[PDB]
Symmetry: C6
Subunit: 219 residues, 6 copies
């Protein structure tokens, strides 16, 4: 499968290049260390993919990893694009969660629960970046505070799923949280597409239910 191999490889290279560009752009020591901790596992992906072609477990690990990296760099980029301190530190810790999970993957390529944990975290990151993009496109204060709210939700849920791979019940609660966050961001996108704030209020109801849930999920 040299075609898929080279495809994944170029994806990894593109991820790393975009990460390094963003890091140079920000001129921030923290973002710098983050981008380095990211490009490292990107290049390690490339190496592992190379040495042993046509091996399915390894290939599966590699594709999911490079996907996570694309997500995280999108997140870092849009974060600095917004420029708001609160959301900036939020997304920074978010991408940190991403790279920590990916590191746990690179240490263990056949532990199912950590694979699924990275999956969930990738989804949460895509959710947060969708929300931030929507907020930027509308440029609406209430939309912005709601985006901060659900990004808080996303980072807290990802933190919790990162802490313990175990605990069925906590796992299901976190899965439901992620579902609610995705729901909120989708309905926000739709409300933006029609330009109606009433469904934005519906979304506010949805995320209010979500955060009330997450509160008890903390314990």
């Amino acid at each position: 499968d040299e075609e898929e191999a080279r495809e994944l490889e170029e994806r990894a290279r593109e991820a790393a290049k975009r990460a390094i560009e963003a890091a140079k752009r920000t001129g921030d020591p923290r973002v710098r260390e983050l981008a380095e901790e990211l490009v490292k596992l990107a290049i390690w992906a490339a190496v592992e993919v190379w040495l042993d072609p046509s091996s399915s477990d390894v290939n599966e690990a590699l594709k999911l990893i490079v996907e996570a990296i694309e997500a995280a760099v999108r997140a870092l980029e849009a974060a600095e694009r917004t420029g708001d301190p609160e959301v900036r530190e939020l997304a920074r810790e978010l991408v940190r969660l991403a790279v920590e999970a990916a590191e746990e993957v690179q240490r263990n390529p056949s532990s199912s629960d950590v694979n699924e944990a990275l999956k969930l975290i990738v989804i949460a990151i895509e959710a947060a970046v969708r929300a931030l993009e929507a907020a930027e496109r509308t440029g609406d204060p209430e939309v912005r505070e709601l985006a901060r709210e659900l990004v808080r939700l996303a980072v807290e849920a990802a933190e919790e799923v990162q802490r313990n791979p175990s605990s069925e019940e906590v796992n299901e609660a976190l899965r439901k949280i992620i579902k609610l966050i995705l729901f909120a961001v989708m309905v926000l996108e739709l409300a933006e597409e029609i330009g109606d704030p009433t469904w934005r209020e519906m979304a506010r109801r949805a995320v209010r239910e979500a955060v009330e849930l997450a509160e008890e999920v903390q314990r």
Copy 2:
């Protein structure tokens, strides 16, 4: 199956957008609440489809659901397009039946009888909307009263199938009812295509048999 995944997803998005457009158009609190109760399960479809790609039961549930939604929005739309109070409230309760069944689906993705119940209700809704379109195209009073008649039949049959998923005998009677309704609407379409009222009288005979049946099916 990312191709089918994205296809279903865009279908769900298009359904929700058309629903919201119709709701804004009508400016009716009732239709508003209906469209909201609809777009909710549409977006929930999108989320569930996303989180777990390539899982067949979930995919099967999602496609059938978005089909039901397309049907219901067509129904709501053509209903307000006609403007007649009787048929308007009729189609409104019809789409309510649709969304209640779909909700029961979203609560349970592997109960066969409720899957088949939604199937039947979708069919009945397609039947009713076909009848209303035919009536609109001909613009004939007798055609209109017959359309009201078989729409009454459709809503009553759907109500009954919604009430109990069980009871083989009631199930078969309702299935036969739906078959007769489809038969009537097809033969009406044909009579419209040739412009002959004699086969409209044949259709009247058919639906008369159908409603006489449904009467005893009530008990």
Copy 3:
């Protein structure tokens, strides 16, 4: 198999439309009742095909049925096209046999013998219509009386196969009859293609053998 589904559906619709056109054209109460008894099972085919897609027994029943209908409408059409009373009543009872068999099918979708009986009757009808078309193209008196003769044979054979699905021996005799009729109509077509009456005399010998056989097949 939505492609084959829609194909069969449009075939059924086209059959019904052509039937209704022919019935309007003839202005004959008998042909009218026949066309109605036909369009009914055509539309019932459409309904049954719809409700349960991708179910093989039902699909098999539907395709064979719509084929029978195409055959019968061709037969009714060419019959009134010829205008001769004898052959007209003949073909009328022929299409009646067709629709009676099709009705027996719609009542029972998994009885093999009646499936095969409809098959044979469809074949006989195609044979008769081929013979009538050939006679019309040549416009030859002897050809016309021979066509009447073998159409008599066809209607009698179809009547007998309709009477009893059972009785191996009568079944084989009727099958041989149908084979001989097809043979006669083919060799007549060929003789027409070359314009030689000598092979028409050979065909006369063939059908003479056929009718002598059918005589004892009556008992």
Copy 4:
């Protein structure tokens, strides 16, 4: 397999048409009776193919039969094209052997030995017609007498294989005879392609061996 069905059917029709054309052309009562005995089984092929589509044994019988017919009509045609009495009666009895074998096939569609017997006879007929065509193209007296010789061989071998389907030893001897005849006609074609009579003498040696063999094969 409607495509292959219609293909075989048109092949049968074309065979019969060419046969009838040739028969009309010759104006010979004998050739007339032959062409009739041929077109009969051609049309019977068409019928049997029709009634029971997608049945492999029947299909296999039909294709082989129509192939035999194409061969025999080619043989009858080229025979009358040459005009020499000896070879004319020879090829006439040849095609008679062909149609007798084909009749035995139409009576029994699953007797292997008669299938193989028709196969061998078809091959022998193709051989004889190849030889006659080659002789016609060269227009050489010695070539013509050699063609008469190996056609005698072919008709005698076909007669013998027609007599008894059994007798392994006689079967193998006849198979070897057919092989030698094919060999002779091929090497004659080649010698014709280069225009060298020396290899014609080699072919004469080959057929001399062949006929010496056939002599003892008679007993």
Copy 5:
């Protein structure tokens, strides 16, 4: 597999035609007898292929045989093209070995060892013809004497493999001989492509090792 059948058949015909052309060209009684002994088995290939299509053992025998024939005619052709007596008689006995092996094949179509023996001999013949072509293209005396040398090797190895199909040890020694000959001719072709005699000396070393081996392989 009528496509592959006709392909093999035309290949056989082309082989025979080229052989006969070469034989006519040389005007040599010996080459004449050789070409005849060749065209015979070519045409016999065609016959056997014909009578029993889609039979794998026979097909396998036929393709390998026609390949051997193509090789041998190439060899005879290039031999007379060179015009040197020594190599001429050499290649003549070479093609004689080829046709003797092919005859043994036509007598026995399922003896594995003789199949492999023909395989090896075909390879050796391709080797010799490659060497002769290379020598002709360079037109170098030392290249010519080396070509004579390795052609001697090839004919001796082929003679030995023809003598006994058995004897694992002699078989492996002959296989190694053929490998060394192929190696020498390839490295000679390469040296010719770059125009460097140093690798020609390397090739001389290779073939010297080869012939020293073959010496003891004689006993």
Copy 6:
């Protein structure tokens, strides 16, 4: 699989031709002997591939071998292209390791460990040539000394894997070494693509860790 066969064959021929060109270009007795020891196994690959087509183990051995050869000739070429004595002797012994492993392969086509050893050595060679190309493109002194460093690493690792095919622990340590070398060369390429020396310092850290590891791997 004649297509893949001819593909591999032409690959082998192209490898040998490029090798001989490079050897002629350098005019160095050592490089000359190396290129000869290389072209020998290239041509032996071609022979073995030829004699036994469609045999998977042999085919697998052949493709991997010709890949190794392409790598080694690239290495020899770029080495003489750089012109630095240290790296020149380094790459020379490198390609010597390559050809020794390939020879061990040609002696044994089904020993797994030596297959994997050649695999690793091929990877290391591709790594070294990537590093040398990168250094040439940047033309940076520090880059050049780092390239010399990791090439030392590569040659030492390849030497060790060549020594013993056994010893799981030494095998895993060498595999990790190769991974680190690939990592370093990739991150160097990236740093070159962006023109930033900071990630070059990161690469220096990586290779420093690598060489500290290799030190203890020596014992």
